[PDB]
C-alpha cells in the first residue's frame, strides 16, 4: 500500500490520501522511503500541493532527507511553489537553515531557478545566509544565471546590506 500513497501524494489526490491515512496504526508507512529515498512529504512538496502537504503535516510527518540531502522545503523552492512553502514555514522554523550534500539551502535553489516570490518569502523570514561548497552565496548563484527579477527584489529588500557583506576573497569565480 506504499506505492498507492506515493502516487496519491505525488499527484495531489487528497481524498485517496485521506482514505489511506484512515488507519493510524503504523506510522512507518507514513515516513517510508523510496527508490530515490523520497517520503510522500517530498512528493507532495515537489509538485506543489499545499493541501496534501498540510494533511501530511497534520497527521504527523518528519522532515527527513533525500539521498541528495534535500528536504521538502528544498523541493518547494526548486519548484517555486509559495503555498506549500508557506505551509512548511508555519509549522517548524528549524527547517529553514538546512544543508544538502552540496551545502545549499532552500534560498540557493529559489535564487538559482529565478522564483522571485519564493526568495521574497524566505527573505521576509530569517533565511540564515551562508556560502556554498564553492563559497557562493545565493546572490552569486542568481547572478551567474542572469536572473534579473530575483536580484532586483533582493535590491529592493531590507536585508541588502547583510547580503552585500558575505563573499570569499579567495575564489576566482565568486568575486
Amino acid at each position: 500500500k506504499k506505492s498507492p500513497l506515493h502516487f496519491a501524494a505525488s499527484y495531489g489526490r487528497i481524498n485517496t490520501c485521506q482514505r489511506l491515512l484512515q488507519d493510524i496504526s503504523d506510522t512507518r508507512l507514513l515516513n517510508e522511503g523510496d527508490l530515490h529515498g523520497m517520503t510522500p512529504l517530498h512528493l507532495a512538496a515537489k509538485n506543489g500541493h499545499d493541501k496534501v502537504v498540510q494533511l501530511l503535516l497534520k497527521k504527523g510527518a518528519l522532515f527527513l532527507s533525500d539521498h541528495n540531502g534535500w528536504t521538502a522545503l528544498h523541493h518547494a523552492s526548486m519548484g517555486g511553489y509559495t503555498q506549500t512553502m508557506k505551509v512548511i514555514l508555519d509549522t517548524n522554523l528549524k527547517c529553514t537553515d538546512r544543508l544538502d550534500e552540496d551545502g545549499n539551502t532552500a534560498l540557493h535553489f529559489a535564487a538559482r531557478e529565478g522564483h522571485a516570490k519564493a526568495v521574497a518569502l524566505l527573505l521576509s523570514h530569517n533565511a540564515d545566509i551562508v556560502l556554498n561548497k564553492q563559497q557562493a552565496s545565493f546572490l552569486h548563484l542568481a547572478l551567474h544565471n542572469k536572473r534579473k527579477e530575483v536580484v532586483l527584489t533582493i535590491i529592493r529588500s531590507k536585508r541588502w546590506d547583510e547580503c552585500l557583506k558575505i563573499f570569499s576573497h579567495n575564489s576566482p569565480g565568486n568575486k
Binding site: 506505492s3 498507492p4 499527484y11 495531489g12 489526490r13 487528497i14 509538485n47 500541493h49
Partner: peptide
Amino acid sequence: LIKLIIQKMEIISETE
C-alpha cells in the same frame, strides 16, 4: 488545468 485533471480523475483497474 491538466494538474487539476490528474487531481480529480477517477482510477479503477489501473491502481498499484
